[PDB]
């Protein structure tokens, strides 16, 4: 669905993605030295690399496989699936004039006989693009990463990501005077599904009392649900996991 005018900010990532996968997928002639086929996201969870790896695809109008490396690794039948997902990417992008895009989530799950075939495959491609996404980029050694020549850090959400990010998760449920611009000055920190999660428990909130009064709606949530959940519910990302996000990128 989702292109990248739905999407707030991000514009360093926008621009990363421009040049290495949108800008020579439309035209290719621009590009005579050559260009990376394998572009890694990197970053904490929960901020959205799955919808921005969707929203290039939409962008260069390409098939998109999303690929899950944490149920390829529990299949053996694991080489073949690798070898087919790559076949399939390769057929269908060469019978259809248009790109085909491999998503994989979690690509650090493939860590050595699936990681082998992997990057043989990989050398192979190199109009087939693999995104590989990681919250833990660590795990993958510089023979892996070689592959990876597009390294893409993609952030906690800034103010105005958490602003978009509240106006969609609340525009579902009934807020009283609730400011928005508040609740985001407060989340410094939190998570795109952090604040999903947040939204999703100042409702519940009401909806247990709505249960426990035995009234028919819930009342209106309010500033005060907010910061009760703000209590309880810290940012699942804490300064620790952003310093190695900081020394693996200095690093790599
Ligand atoms: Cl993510």
Same mark, same amino acid.
Do not use: C
């Given at each position: 669905?989702?292109?990248?005018?739905?999407?707030?900010?991000?514009?360093?990532?926008?621009?990363?993605?421009?040049?290495?996968?949108?800008?020579?997928?439309?035209?290719?002639?621009?590009?005579?030295?050559?260009?990376?086929?394998?572009?890694?996201?990197?970053?904490?969870?929960?901020?959205?690399?799955?919808?921005?790896?969707?929203?290039?695809?939409?962008?260069?109008?390409?098939?998109?496989?999303?690929?899950?490396?944490?149920?390829?690794?529990?299949?053996?039948?694991?080489?073949?699936?690798?070898?087919?997902?790559?076949?399939?990417?390769?057929?269908?992008?060469?019978?259809?004039?248009?790109?085909?895009?491999?998503?994989?989530?979690?690509?650090?799950?493939?860590?050595?006989?699936?990681?082998?075939?992997?990057?043989?495959?990989?050398?192979?491609?190199?109009?087939?693009?693999?995104?590989?996404?990681?919250?833990?980029?660590?795990?993958?050694? +510089?023979?892996?990463?070689?592959? =990876?020549?597009?390294?893409?850090?993609?952030?906690? !959400?800034?103010? /105005? $990501?958490? #602003?978009?990010?509240?106006?969609?998760?609340?525009?579902?449920?009934?807020?009283?005077?609730?400011?928005?611009?508040?609740?985001?000055?407060?989340?410094?920190?939190?998570?795109?599904?952090?604040?999903?999660?947040?939204?999703?428990?100042?409702?519940?909130?009401?909806?247990?009392?709505?249960?426990?009064?035995?009234?028919?709606?819930?009342? +209106?949530?309010?500033?005060?649900? =907010?910061?009760?959940?703000?209590?309880?519910?810290? !940012?699942?990302? /804490? $300064?620790? #996991?952003?310093?190695?996000?900081?020394?693996?990128?200095?690093?790599?």
């Amino acid at each position: 669905k989702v292109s990248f005018s739905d999407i707030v900010g991000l514009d360093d990532v926008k621009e990363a993605l421009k040049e290495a996968i949108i800008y020579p997928s439309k035209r290719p002639d621009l590009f005579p030295l050559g260009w990376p086929r394998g572009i890694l996201l990197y970053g904490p969870p929960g901020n959205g690399k799955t919808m921005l790896a969707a929203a290039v695809a939409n962008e260069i109008d390409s098939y998109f496989i999303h690929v899950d490396a944490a149920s390829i690794m529990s299949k053996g039948e694991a080489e073949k699936n690798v070898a087919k997902i790559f076949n399939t990417a390769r057929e269908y992008s060469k019978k259809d004039n248009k790109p085909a895009i491999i998503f994989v989530d979690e690509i650090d799950a493939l860590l050595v006989r699936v990681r082998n075939q992997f990057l043989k495959e990989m050398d192979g491609i190199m109009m087939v693009y693999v995104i590989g996404a990681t919250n833990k980029p660590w795990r993958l050694d +510089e023979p892996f990463l070689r592959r =990876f020549q597009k390294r893409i850090y993609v952030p906690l !959400p800034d103010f /105005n $990501q958490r #602003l978009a990010l509240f106006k969609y998760y609340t525009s579902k449920v009934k807020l009283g005077n609730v400011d928005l611009q508040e609740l985001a000055k407060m989340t410094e920190g939190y998570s795109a599904s952090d604040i999903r999660d947040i939204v999703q428990s100042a409702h519940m909130r009401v909806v247990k009392e709505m249960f426990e009064k035995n009234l028919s709606e819930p009342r +209106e949530i309010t500033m005060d649900d =907010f910061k009760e959940v703000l209590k309880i519910r810290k !940012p699942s990302v /804490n $300064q620790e #996991l952003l310093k190695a996000y900081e020394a693996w990128t200095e690093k790599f």
